[PDB]
Enzyme design. Structure first.
Site, short mmCIF file in Angstrom:
data_model
loop_
_atom_site.label_atom_id
_atom_site.label_comp_id
_atom_site.label_asym_id
_atom_site.label_seq_id
_atom_site.Cartn_x
_atom_site.Cartn_y
_atom_site.Cartn_z
CG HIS A 1 -3.56 -11.85 -2.89
ND1 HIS A 1 -4.61 -11.44 -3.67
CD2 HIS A 1 -3.16 -10.77 -2.16
CE1 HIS A 1 -4.89 -10.16 -3.37
NE2 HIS A 1 -4.01 -9.71 -2.46
CG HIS B 1 -2.18 -1.01 0.80
ND1 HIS B 1 -3.44 -0.87 1.32
CD2 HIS B 1 -2.22 -2.05 -0.04
CE1 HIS B 1 -4.21 -1.82 0.78
NE2 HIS B 1 -3.51 -2.50 -0.07
C1 HEM Z 1 -5.67 -6.33 -7.90
C2 HEM Z 1 -4.73 -6.02 -6.96
C3 HEM Z 1 -5.17 -6.35 -5.57
C4 HEM Z 1 -6.37 -6.47 -4.95
C5 HEM Z 1 -7.78 -6.11 -5.38
C6 HEM Z 1 -6.06 -6.76 -3.58
C7 HEM Z 1 -7.03 -6.94 -2.63
C8 HEM Z 1 -6.81 -7.30 -1.29
C9 HEM Z 1 -7.75 -7.33 -0.25
C10 HEM Z 1 -9.24 -6.93 -0.27
C11 HEM Z 1 -7.05 -7.71 0.87
C12 HEM Z 1 -7.65 -7.92 2.20
C13 HEM Z 1 -7.43 -6.81 3.20
C14 HEM Z 1 -8.04 -7.21 4.52
O1 HEM Z 1 -9.34 -7.31 4.57
O2 HEM Z 1 -7.25 -7.33 5.59
C15 HEM Z 1 -5.69 -7.96 0.58
C16 HEM Z 1 -4.71 -8.58 1.41
C17 HEM Z 1 -3.40 -8.74 1.04
N1 HEM Z 1 -2.82 -8.37 -0.12
FE1 HEM Z 1 -3.82 -7.79 -1.74
N2 HEM Z 1 -4.75 -7.05 -3.47
C18 HEM Z 1 -4.15 -6.63 -4.51
C19 HEM Z 1 -2.81 -6.70 -4.84
C20 HEM Z 1 -1.82 -7.01 -3.92
C21 HEM Z 1 -0.42 -6.96 -4.18
C22 HEM Z 1 0.16 -6.36 -5.39
C23 HEM Z 1 0.26 -7.38 -3.05
C24 HEM Z 1 1.71 -7.51 -2.74
C25 HEM Z 1 2.63 -7.75 -3.51
C26 HEM Z 1 -0.73 -7.78 -2.08
C27 HEM Z 1 -0.51 -8.37 -0.86
C28 HEM Z 1 -1.49 -8.58 0.03
C29 HEM Z 1 -1.17 -9.25 1.30
C30 HEM Z 1 0.17 -9.72 1.80
C31 HEM Z 1 -2.36 -9.32 1.94
C32 HEM Z 1 -2.73 -9.94 3.25
C33 HEM Z 1 -2.87 -9.04 4.45
C34 HEM Z 1 -2.85 -9.76 5.77
O3 HEM Z 1 -2.44 -10.97 5.88
O4 HEM Z 1 -3.21 -9.08 6.73
N3 HEM Z 1 -2.05 -7.61 -2.70
N4 HEM Z 1 -5.60 -7.78 -0.85
#
Ligand code: HEM
Ligand code: HEM
Ligand SMILES: NNC(=O)c1ccncc1
Ligand SMILES: NNC(=O)c1ccncc1
Ligand SMILES: [Cl-]
Ligand SMILES: [Cl-]
Ligand code: NA
Ligand code: NA
Lengths: 713, 713
Positions: free
Chosen positions: B244, B77
């Site tokens: 993810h 972010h």
């Molecule tokens: C289309 C692009 C993306 C979408 C729509 C998206 C969407 C989301 C959403 C909705 C969450 C959940 C947040 C929550 O409710 O705690 C999340 C978690 C996460 N995303 Fe993404 N994401 C995107 C791209 C990315 C990218 C580019 C990365 C890193 C390289 C990333 C890494 C993460 C990680 C590590 C989590 C987990 C957070 C946790 O374990 O607390 N995401 N994503």
């Protein structure tokens, strides 16, 4: 473009502390206006301005062939935004040329006046500021028309962006009272710190209160707003009648002819506004306010014709060509000249607010005295005009140039000249050691010196430790100053001073104003020593002690801190959140957000709180100068909740155990809440920050001590 | 409090040029972050961050006992606000900790993440910025979970107040498209410079476009938003699937449980927000987005399970406990671990946006390739993550510390090392004399050097004269660069260079990059000489010439000036007024309002306008460096009016005679209109200002010349 202000409209706004940076300033960081002005050939400027008065420009033709009236009005408005409540407004920063003041309805066609002055501005460049030029022009106008002014001081440096000033909450220019953002409540009580009856007015509505043409009721508003501008009845009559000795109003046709104010006009307007569609749009056809009054038979010459007319005739209500209420002398002869047509003459006319000078019983007595003794009127008007136009310039030490009056006036909070050798570094160290050996505590020394210094406000440059007015009425009795503790501290300091001064040869001595400050410095040095740090707090001698006789007690009332977040003090309950009052105070003290943060965190642990409150004293080593406020404020091991007894006080408890560790106010906790202040707090709260904290504290302390020391500039 | 912004909501806002002053900055004026970081023990920080990963705090318990996922999202972010259109956003200023980004809905619970880092921040102090710490923590998270990163560079200095960025016009968080401030028009065309689908999102809506759960349509938004963040298809699949592979989403109960964002929360919340009323409000009960998805069987360990699941199952639409659309594996066993309860397991789930990686035909091919070749996946994700988190860092010369990757990447706009002695002052004087003897005009030289230097933007530190990219595709062909004139100037310079270099001993040579700049300086010296002023313009050698193969032509497209008020250029007709685009440009060039004013007024009279336009060329001595722009702009003898042909061009006529004197554009006239800009213009237009003008011009010129010279810091 959606902004932080749109999303979070009640968050704190710190940008007000960071205006006037070197980034916005076109002059070099070494530019010194005082030294440029001291070499200005002021006589030459005044000759050019004299020439101007009668050199009419066709884009804004001079009434009666003489711009005097217009420029007197321009200078009056420049000075006339001043409010005693906070010292904000006034002429001393030339803010008439920026938003919003350049576009206030009461400032209509003052854009033309300012533009007339560009060639002279341009000629003399940085040696005369716009700020000074607007006031000088007023003076020259009066002089050109036969009126001897009291004097003139240069020294008002130009500013380069608009000030952040609360002008009211109305969203509509000139809104009548009793709206959703009414500045009035109760029995026509105007909200502090305001000093005008409607948004975009200088003082009052010339038709009368909310446009009701009752001279008696108008007089009430006049008196209230003028008092809020530091003018008593004598000064107010002198100023109004003095000013309306000259020129005329402009109201040749309906007001719907007049276009957009300067900040809303098109780019082609080049900073001018109120373009009029009425006939030629200027000169004989001018529309400014919509009134059409010419007060005197010689609008370009000093006379006592204003009072001759006011009293000489009986007045009947009438309407200007724009439909505004105004008064005409019933069946007078047509004796008042037309501004452009030498074959027309008009009857005497007056504003409702002019009639106030005759039909308010208090004003009438003054006005009659002025009518029967027009030399008294001239002397009063001269004094009042000087006071008006210099009221926010600060100490006489800032006054520049060859026309500064020698007479010292009570309203100047004068400080006696120093006639004796000053203490030196070795003497200062001996006094500091004596102050510390007396048994005065860190907390007492710091609180006293804070109380003395922190009355300063940058808006009109009133206040500060110079004078030792903390020992006099009314300061000695302000609740924030802890009158009983103060009296004990002052007694011990005065004994140290007497002993020191008695031991000297060769006339050397120390003032109590200096010793209060120096004792504060000892306090901060001892605090640092309690924390294991050896520091010297810089000290500059040369304050002098003012007498009670040189201290206007009523005028001093407005300097009383009712909110001082630096001592965790709130005198009562206010609608404005305490943290907002903190930032306002920091702005008056000329502090940036970092300086405010360091200073407050140090003061907390030094024991500067009023009443020895523990709120925000987040240290177990009170009276040691440490960064404990910050380390403890930021400790996530503590959880904060508002108390059941008071929503404005918070308990900080150990998150694991529930044990009560601290209490704080909104002023204390804002530093852990607001994202910009927390970022600052974080710097001072870091493990590498002890030395930085002390050095920055001492710097800001020193800065506060020296705010009014224009004798050293 | 009613403000100038309320009264005049479409006025120019110059405060954006004066943020980030010394006043708002707690660090000394001499503080140099690079030098503080170079002494940080980076290894020790990384040990502390490793320890943190599994030190669960009760106030925000770690999922699966490991904060890795959370911190990966945090770092993502931080980087993910970046837009290629203006270079604004990204990680490089740590703006995630300020408004508005600290309170964007897509940043929910990142306040907790940042707070978990405070002890480490505090420990190391000024030696590691928050900006750097956020990205480092991301790296350590990945490393702790078994993923080897491509490397890390420190050097992102902290900032102290919020940036002024256009994030959109919507007045409602997350507003869906087609509202009164829609960021979309036409065939789902997202307005430049925006790079997210809804106000308060990073890229796209995880439920699908405007909340409609169509993976194919979602893939369209993904592609467009990621492209606007500088990522192609391969990078995007790698990043999404890579990220993810870890952690989970949070959606344990209805979203109406979740309270105020940090900027709206109470003081007692101490900078945190989104307090939840659902059960415990944290841990197993956490609500962040409302989705409840856990992607892999080992959410705390790098695996190849994301693609196994994506392709391994068929997906059915379902709802989270908060009601959000999401997908569950048809027929699957419960194989995904619970974050808190060792006795629960769950079926594999996916976001609509995850399924985009399989159902978009182009992503499917990449995704399959990554599935079948996980080493290619791991290497792509490493590279992409490095690019993501370093994209706005600028030249490799800014990269600090011991983990900087040796490999030079195309997206860094790399500059070859200089391996030979640099020209010295005598050589610079010789080249200047040659340039001036060749017949190149002041206007040619100044325009070329301007065109080369002024591609720089401070937002992501891309662009500038280093590289001599002006001679390559696509810069050499940009309309604003006047391709034909440019080609003639470069040909003559290239001949001077070849001759000079051919005459040297001992390997000395001059790059074309340096010569373009030096020639610009010669042109300015000549202009000053034309005006009667003896001026030497500072020059610093050491630029090198980058090759076409080191210059990604698509990536360079976003640096094309479509609006350059400094050359009176507008490529088309835009909704944003030209003066607004001028101030935006000045902001990217790091110019204050005075610098912008002096610079523009000088460029006008030097002949820098595109197409030799006379607009704003208010001099009768073009190619002489004088203050004529200002003196003539402010001359009240001239009246301005918009032309009948074009409302955006103005004719200035002698007020008395009607004679046509000048024409100008809005960019030209705004300096005589806007009250703050006019005040600046007035300093430069004064009779004592000719030398000041010249000296200030030369200073700003040199500043612009040196904007990308991080090799000299
Ligand atoms: C289309 C692009 C993306 C979408 C729509 C998206 C969407 C989301 C959403 C909705 C969450 C959940 C947040 C929550 O409710 O705690 C999340 C978690 C996460 N995303 Fe993404 N994401 C995107 C791209 C990315 C990218 C580019 C990365 C890193 C390289 C990333 C890494 C993460 C990680 C590590 C989590 C987990 C957070 C946790 O374990 O607390 N995401 N994503
Ligand atoms: C109750 C206080 C005051 C009221 C309501 C008031 C009202 C006004 C109004 C309505 C005008 C006409 C503006 C226009 O249409 O052009 C004006 C003109 C003028 N006022 Fe005042 N005034 C007040 C006090 C003052 C004071 C304190 C001074 C100066 C000492 C001043 C000096 C002038 C002058 C010189 C003009 C003439 C403008 C010209 O000739 O262009 N007034 N006043
Ligand atoms: N509005 N202006 C002020 O509050 C101020 C001006 C200069 N120094 C301190 C405060
Ligand atoms: N919004 N951020 C910028 O425009 C910027 C930041 C740092 N240097 C130049 C421009
Ligand atoms: Cl002010
Ligand atoms: Cl930004
Ligand atoms: Na003031
Ligand atoms: Na950026």
């Amino acid at each position: 473009g959606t902004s932080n202000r749109d999303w979070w409209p009640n968050q704190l706004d710190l940008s007000i502390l960071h205006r006037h940076s070197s980034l916005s300033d076109p002059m070099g960081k070494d530019f010194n206006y005082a030294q440029a002005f001291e070499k200005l050939d002021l006589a030459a400027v005044k000759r050019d301005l004299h020439a101007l008065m009668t050199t009419s420009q066709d884009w804004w033709p001079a009434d009666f062939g003489h711009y005097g009236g217009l420029f007197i009005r321009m200078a009056w408005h420049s000075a006339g935004t001043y409010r005693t409540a906070d010292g904000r407004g006034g002429a001393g920063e030339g803010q008439q040329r920026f938003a919003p003041l350049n576009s206030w309805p009461d400032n209509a066609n003052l854009d033309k006046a300012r533009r007339l002055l560009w060639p002279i501005k341009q000629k003399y460049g940085r040696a005369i500021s716009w700020a000074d030029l607007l006031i000088l022009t007023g003076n020259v106008a009066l002089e050109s028309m036969g009126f001897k002014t009291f004097g003139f001081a240069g020294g008002r440096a130009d500013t380069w962006e608009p000030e952040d000033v609360y002008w009211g909450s109305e969203k509509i220019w000139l809104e009548l009272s009793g709206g959703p953002n009414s500045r009035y409540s109760g029995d026509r009580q105007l909200e502090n710190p305001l000093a005008a009856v409607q948004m975009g007015l200088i003082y009052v509505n010339p038709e009368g209160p909310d446009g009701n043409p009752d001279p008696v009721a108008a007089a009430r508003d006049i008196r209230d707003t003028f008092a809020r501008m530091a003018m008593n009845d004598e000064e107010t009559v002198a100023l109004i009648a003095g000013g309306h000795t000259f020129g005329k109003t402009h109201g040749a046709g309906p007001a719907s002819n007049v276009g957009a104010e300067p900040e809303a006009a098109g780019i082609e307007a080049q900073g001018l506004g109120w373009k009029s569609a009425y006939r030629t749009g200027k000169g004989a056809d001018a529309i400014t306010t919509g009134l059409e009054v010419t007060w005197t038979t010689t609008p370009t010459q000093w006379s006592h014709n204003f009072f001759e007319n006011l009293f000489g005739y009986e007045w009947e209500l009438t309407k200007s060509p724009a439909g505004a209420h105004q008064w005409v002398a019933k069946g007078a002869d047509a004796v008042i000249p037309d501004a452009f047509d030498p074959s027309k003459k008009h009857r005497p006319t007056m504003l409702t607010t002019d009639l106030s000078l005759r039909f308010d019983p208090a004003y009438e007595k003054i006005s009659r005295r002025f009518h029967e003794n027009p030399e008294q009127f001239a002397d009063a008007f001269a004094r009042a005009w000087f006071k008006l136009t210099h009221r926010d310039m600060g100490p006489r030490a800032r006054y520049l140039g060859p026309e500064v009056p020698a007479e010292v006036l009570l309203w100047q909070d004068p400080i006696p000249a120093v006639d004796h050798p000053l203490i030196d570094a070795a003497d200062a160290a001996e006094l500091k050691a004596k102050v510390l050996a007396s048994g005065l505590t860190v907390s007492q020394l710091v609180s006293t010196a804070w109380a003395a210094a922190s009355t300063f406000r940058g808006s009109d440059k009133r206040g500060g430790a110079n004078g030792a007015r903390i020992r006099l009425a009314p300061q000695k009795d302000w609740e924030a100053n802890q009158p009983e503790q103060l009296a004990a501290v002052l007694e011990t300091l005065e004994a140290i001073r007497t002993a020191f001064n008695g031991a000297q040869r060769g006339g050397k001595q120390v003032s109590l104003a200096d010793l209060i400050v120096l004792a504060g410095c000892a306090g901060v040095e001892q605090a640092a020593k309690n924390a294991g740090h050896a520091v010297t707090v810089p000290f500059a001698p040369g304050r002098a002690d003012a007498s009670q006789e040189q201290t206007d007690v009523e005028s001093m009332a407005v300097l009383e801190p009712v909110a001082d977040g630096f001592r965790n003090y709130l005198k009562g309950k206010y609608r404005v959140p305490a943290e907002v009052l903190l930032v306002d105070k920091a702005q008056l003290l000329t502090l940036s957000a970092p300086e405010m943060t360091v200073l407050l965190g140090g003061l907390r642990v030094l024991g500067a709180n009023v009443g020895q409150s523990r709120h925000g004293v987040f240290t177990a080593r009170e009276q040691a100068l440490t960064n404990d406020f910050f380390v403890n404020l930021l400790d996530m091991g503590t959880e904060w909740k508002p108390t059941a007894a008071d929503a404005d006080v918070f308990e900080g408890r150990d998150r694991a155990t529930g044990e009560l560790k601290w209490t704080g106010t909104r002023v204390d906790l804002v530093f852990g809440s607001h994202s910009q202040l927390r970022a600052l707090a974080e710097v001072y709260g870091s493990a590498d920050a002890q030395e930085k904290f002390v050095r920055d504290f001492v710097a800001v302390w020193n800065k506060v001590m020296n705010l009014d020391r224009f004798d050293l500039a």
